[PDB]
UniProtKB/Swiss-Prot annotation, chains A, B:
<protein>
    <recommendedName>
        <fullName>AF4/FMR2 family member 4</fullName>
    </recommendedName>
</protein>
<comment type="similarity">
    <text>Belongs to the AF4 family.</text>
</comment>
<comment type="subunit">
    <text>Component of the super elongation complex (SEC), at least composed of EAF1, EAF2, CDK9, MLLT3/AF9, AFF (AFF1 or AFF4), the P-TEFb complex and ELL (ELL, ELL2 or ELL3). Interacts with ELL3; the interaction is direct. Interacts with ELL2; the interaction is direct and leads to stabilize ELL2 and prevent ELL2 ubiquitination and degradation.</text>
</comment>
<comment type="function">
    <text>Key component of the super elongation complex (SEC), a complex required to increase the catalytic rate of RNA polymerase II transcription by suppressing transient pausing by the polymerase at multiple sites along the DNA. In the SEC complex, AFF4 acts as a central scaffold that recruits other factors through direct interactions with ELL proteins (ELL, ELL2 or ELL3) and the P-TEFb complex. In case of infection by HIV-1 virus, the SEC complex is recruited by the viral Tat protein to stimulate viral gene expression.</text>
</comment>
<feature type="modified residue" description="Phosphoserine">
    <location>
        <position position="137"/>
    </location>
</feature>
Length: 216, 216
């Protein structure tokens, strides 16, 4: 067993993008699904590195979103639920799901401000509009279109961590099935922490796991 | 320094409630704010223990919600932002904010199912209702009241982890100001993990911190 030693020379968001694109076009031009997915996942981490480098001198939202799309494509390659699925396929899938979960959670986190005060005004008006459509009794609803767009966007950015939570839990569950591989990987890297691991932690974790997979 | 040894005999949700209520009525009848808050926080953990015991033979939602209310009351006692605020006040506040954060996150988590498919239907209709209020051009909005109630509830349960995230981050920030006390507490208990620590982990963590505070 060997641990990657990691270069601290942080580059420009541009450098990681041609890295990612090259790994990805390397993936695009190969036969064996497994092979493809590995390179796709390597491409993915370079894409993540690029987004991280955007966040250093401030927007990474599009880059991250499209990266989660490339992760779903990749997972649909050697589907871990297939009955022939190998341990390698399942470990690959786990790494994919960690990247996808924490990516979703970052996509959210970029719009946390929006989400919070949107929640305030929305809670207020989703009571005003309702109290005003019901004639009192002594003894469809119509909303301002601003309120409507604010509802649309609130659901938009809250969806991202609904996905993050659910996918995080799939990663944990499927990880129990490769308890040893991921026990050792958590040993040498430290385990990923939902809400605490930054993008560089994820990048290195994923790189190390990809390294062991390519070594078999 | 001494670590509490913890009793594994899990009791009924009823047993913890009269424990909590007794600690709380002990708090209610004392002068010194600090004193009060300590007992309030002890009351709180018994209240949490009670809610946990509800979850064992399946609803803890009300109990948890009202407990977070007792936590905000308690924090409004020796406000850590006061200029006379002691290290003890600040540590107490940190413990309060962990309980409040993870309580919010559980309140959410109880309704995760609701939230997810609500997100689906809401995203669809928040496009149907909008595409149908805008006359096309070749070259306020009205919604079903079911959709309206679903929007209200979706915002309701997503608010809970918006709070959980924000309060979690306040706890981290204020924790940097008592880095050593909480470094040692994480040492002997293991640190609380957002999204991973279960209620019993929180109970024991908080109990241990309360123990050191009462020892000064």
């Amino acid at each position: 067993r060997t641990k990657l030693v990691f270069d601290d020379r942080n580059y420009s968001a541009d450098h990681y993008l041609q890295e990612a694109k090259k790994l990805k076009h390397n993936a695009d031009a190969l036969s064996d699904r497994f092979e493809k997915a590995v390179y796709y996942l390597d491409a993915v981490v370079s894409f993540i590195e690029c987004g991280n480098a955007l966040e250093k001198n401030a927007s990474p939202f599009p880059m991250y979103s499209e990266t989660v799309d490339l992760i779903k494509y990749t997972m649909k390659l050697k589907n871990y639920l297939a009955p022939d699925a190998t341990a390698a396929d399942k470990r690959l899938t786990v790494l994919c799901l960690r990247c996808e979960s924490l990516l979703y959670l970052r996509l959210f986190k970029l719009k946390k401000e929006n989400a919070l005060k949107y929640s305030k005004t929305l809670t207020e008006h989703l009571k005003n509009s309702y109290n005003n459509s019901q004639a009192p009794s002594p003894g469809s609803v119509t909303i301002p279109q601003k309120i409507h767009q604010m509802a649309a966007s609130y659901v938009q950015v809250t969806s991202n961590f609904l996905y993050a939570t659910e996918i995080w839990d799939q990663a944990e569950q499927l990880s129990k099935e490769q308890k040893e591989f991921f026990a050792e990987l958590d040993k040498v890297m430290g385990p990923l922490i939902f809400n605490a691991s930054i993008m560089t932690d994820l990048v290195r974790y994923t790189r190390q796991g990809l390294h062991w997979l390519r070594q078999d």
